[model samples]
Target: QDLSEALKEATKEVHIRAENSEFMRNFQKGQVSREGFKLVMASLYHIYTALEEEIERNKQNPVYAPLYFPEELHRRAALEQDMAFWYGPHWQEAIPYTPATQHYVKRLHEVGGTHPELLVAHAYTRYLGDLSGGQVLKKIAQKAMALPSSGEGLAFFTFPSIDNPTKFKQLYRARMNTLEMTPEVKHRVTEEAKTAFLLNIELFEELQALLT
Candidate 1:
């Protein structure tokens, strides 16, 4: 019943492809452009808004109740700040809502509202992903874009409540392992995690197309 381990092994394939997506590879190469960065920040603002909103709706549900660590993991508010910095004070209006982003949000709402059991998959993929390599991406972004040392535009990567991301993820995985799941439910959750990654991959590809 080590759900976390199962989830990890299952998503390993798509996770690698997600990292190698052209949009993400640019991030690794420190070749992120300002417009590209702003578009992604806008996309994340919409994504996290939907994900966290769905998360709120399922915080009490049996399948999702165990992993409700909002303070340490929520990115909606942080993404909002990044949008304001990149898109100016009127970012809410300036932000682009691409078709790919809308589809991702639609899936999240579908999972959170009707198929709540699948919410765990989305939470695990997105939150754990940010805590993994997002910090290094933050530095690469700051230097490539020449943002101030004050960390103004990079709020999405900064987890204020998390003092140690690795230790916190260990604890988060422990919580995941404790959640009750049957063989069927565990299998479904693993499948949904891949869906979550595919959703992200689509958005990244859309971003690359729009920017290119």
Candidate 2:
């Protein structure tokens, strides 16, 4: 519990530093575009909520070590596959049929370039952020379903494979039930998650610094 709280405090400071960056300032001044701005907010909210829930859950069930790092590699693979698929999609026959949507598709690759390190850090945070807060991750998955590729584009962040996520949750619970780890290892993982979050925020700040 103490460790989790400390992680929050550390990340809050990092976010403040990011908020003060030129990129953030420029972002505030309407430089990133409303759509781009929404994506940023969505990205941040996704992490913030996931972490908040997980930190609290740690107090109750500290035994379940998150499977983020392992899952992250698979997610990266899925995202790569999706991007390539998008590139080959017939623009005129695409579901989101629009030049703007096409641009957004292209922008996805550019966004990946803009902050590869940040992306890695963000991915790491999501991994650890749900140690015991698996419920929150489920909520995120639901919310994600309402977004752009909400239904169709499942590669970027989809879990392994399950027709029903509720079943997936049960499977994960069983996996967690069979899990074993020392308290020291638990703390180490949480601390790593915290550090990843802070680094991600720092990277955003660095990007924001260029806003002006």
Candidate 3:
């Protein structure tokens, strides 16, 4: 419902921010090679297909109620599609990579370029977290993206086209302003965002414990 619109607004900002980054610019402008980007995108596209189908599965079945978040899950789904497009073959082919600039791509492959599920989860949670934790989600991504292991190991953490933080707030507030739902629905959406954050916390925690 209203949440979908809000999420879309937020998603648009993140996409813009990601696509405008130096790393993305290198690849999209022919500075870096395409191998890692291709592999990562293919993996993500395949993953999105699976997740999208799964989400649509229960939409019409009352037994499997659809998960509602202000707006349907369509906003995150749309963001996923946007990511696939920018990172897909067309974008890479449109820009040609030079030999010297290929190191980043090579490093990406060496360190495990992308994990589709993690990317999906991160995308999902970023919108969810923004509704709940505001800048904390962006802060985490900034911190995550800055780690020495960031380049390829944390490729999933990157986004394109999102540049201004103030713009994000302006767009987010604009979306939020359009809501016509009752207090109950607002609470429902907020709770949904909270649940998403908790799930992410558990996901990272379990992964950490498993590593140890």
lDDT of 1 by residue, 62-120 (tens): 78899999988999889888888889988878999999999999999999998999899
Residue range 93-184, candidate 2, lDDT tens digits: 32222232333323333323442212222333444333323334334434533435343333544555445555544454344334344466
lDDT of 3 by residue, 1-212 (tens): 46555444435544455445444344344433334343433333333344444445433432123232324233334434434444544542443333222432232232222222122222344443433443443344335334243333323333333455456545654544454545655444444434334433343333223323
By lDDT, the best candidate is 1
**Of 1 and 2, which scores higher on lDDT?**
1
In model 2, the worst 10-residue window by lDDT is 91-100
CA displacement after TM-score superposition, residue 97 of candidate 3 (Å): 32
* Alpha carbon lDDT of each predicted model: 0.90, 0.41, 0.39
The candidate maximizing TM-score is 1
Using Cα atoms with residue i matched to residue i, what is each candidate's TM-score against the true structure? 0.97, 0.37, 0.35
- Per-residue error for 121 in candidate 3, Å, reads 13
TM-score of 1: 0.97
lDDT of 2: 0.41
Residue 121, model 1, lDDT: 95
